[PDB]
Amino acid sequence: LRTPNFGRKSLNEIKEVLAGMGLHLGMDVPNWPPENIEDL
DNA sequence: GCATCCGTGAGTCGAGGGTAATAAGCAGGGATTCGCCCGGGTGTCAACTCTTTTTTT
Known part of the structure; x- marks a missing residue:
């Protein structure tokens, strides 16, 4: 909500399509693979 | 009633890979065929106006 034009x-x-993919809010370390080592 | 002459046959699966020779001449007129170019119908883009789903007030 703190973004301009927060739909x-x-x-x-967007939350529904994210949950459908297998991921949800949090449920992981904050920015775990934040480097280029996770690139495939 | 017999002697002489003309058609069909020849197993079946496999390999091995392409070929080869003669050779007139020119004048008339048409049908054919390849280059350029204008062009009108097919695409690819700047650029002017209604609607509305919210996101902001």
């Missing part, structure tokens, strides 16, 4: 209806669809 109220799109924030729910």
Whole structure:
């Protein structure tokens, strides 16, 4: 919500599509693979 | 009633890989065919106006 044009209806669809992919809010270390070592 | 002459046959699977020779001449007129170019229908882009789903007030 602290971003310009924070889509109220799109924030729910994006969370739904993220949960459908297998990921959710948090559930991991904060920026674990933040380097280029995780690039495939 | 017999003697003489003309058609069909020849197993079946496999290998091995392409070929080869003669050789007139020129004048008339048409049909054919290749280069350039204008062009009109097909694409690829700057650029002017309604609607509305919110995101902001």
